[PDB]
């Protein structure tokens, strides 16, 4: 079939079992144990000095645990990257996810990470976003203009950027 991909990432949903994750991602692309604990780590294509990848976290180490955490780098491409340093500068701690997206652009970000500590409740949900400017994203190399925006309960906690103009 293939390596891990953005499509596969979007298909895997919170609430799924380990077996459902493997079936979708392709067990040949995934690993568990070692440095990933009881999480399932699935590799995409070669990229930079590593590769695009996804990591799925579970409610517990039980064989019947459910996905409560999804993370990835370089599987997802922004839909319409319109971020700039100026817009990044307007992003303010305390903004709601809706407000931040309104500032940086509705299609400038991808989900780096999303975790539900109280799954299935959304209480305490942490959201980590990777946002890019027009030419910033790179799925096989190094970004050339990007930002990291992170929230808790839908409220921005902090921001940081690299190489934006």
């Amino acid at each position: 079939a293939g390596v891990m991909t953005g499509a596969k990432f979007t298909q895997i949903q919170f609430g799924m079992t380990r077996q459902q994750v493997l079936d979708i991602a392709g067990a040949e692309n995934c690993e568990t144990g070692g440095s990933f604990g009881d999480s399932i780590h699935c590799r995409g294509h070669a990229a930079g000095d590593y590769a695009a990848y996804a990591t799925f976290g579970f409610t517990s180490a039980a064989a019947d645990a459910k996905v409560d955490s999804k993370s990835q780098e370089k599987l997802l491409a922004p839909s319409a990257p319109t971020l700039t340093l100026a817009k990044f500068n307007q992003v303010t701690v305390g903004m709601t996810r809706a407000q931040v997206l309104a500032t940086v652009g509705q299609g400038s970000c991808t989900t780096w990470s999303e975790y539900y500590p109280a799954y299935p409740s959304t209480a305490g949900v942490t959201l980590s976003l990777s946002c890019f400017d027009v030419d910033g994203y790179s799925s096989t190399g190094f970004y050339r203009g990007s930002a990291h925006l992170w929230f808790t309960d839908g409220v921005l906690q902090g921001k940081r950027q690299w190489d934006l103009v």
Partner: protein, 263 residues
Amino acid sequence: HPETLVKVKDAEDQLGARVGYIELDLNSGKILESFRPEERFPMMSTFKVLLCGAVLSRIDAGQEQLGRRIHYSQNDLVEYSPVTEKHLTDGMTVRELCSAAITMSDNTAANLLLTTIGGPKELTAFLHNMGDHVTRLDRWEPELNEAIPNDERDTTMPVAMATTLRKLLTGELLTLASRQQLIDWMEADKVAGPLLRSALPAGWFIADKSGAGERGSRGIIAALGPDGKPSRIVVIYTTGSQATMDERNRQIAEIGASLIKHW
């Protein structure tokens, strides 16, 4: 060693960029062969082995603890951090940071480890103190990978890197325990499959660390040898090429295939 230098030449002609190469004898420390051994190339992630060698020396001197747990936050996460991102809530021990930095080339782990020693200047001071006056780290991840033409920031020379690596893996610089750990981390490298490991015959040992950057920058440092025992250090760097990553890896892999054949 013999025929490997035409390949290094060929590679330079296939990639249309500079290629630096040096093979050292692990035991004697004598240079076996070289090509542009004294030109600067961006270290990229290959610096992480030097970083953890510095961390291990601090452990040896009671200055650091492999089991010490470092708690970091979202602000610290940077591009290419598969292990640190997963352990963000619980943190990671110094030992786990080196394992991630070296075997998975985790960038946040390297930045965390740099902070434990005082930053890029202190890694440079550490290197300078052990006789290496060429290798220099100036920036954190991910900037150190820019490989700007003529820019000497975050660079080394094949010769300086090969000798420094030899001193770390076989000197008295580190204890046998630290040497075991550092080489084992390199032995367990999981991201360098397309380079030297792709031409490594069965039964052969290899402990390595690769690097990739912008401007077609690609490199690798290794201690390898037949009969599951390392006997030579190999250091290969290239930068400036426009060829695909697969082509750049292929050339490095071919260099390796040659040095193996004419061992």
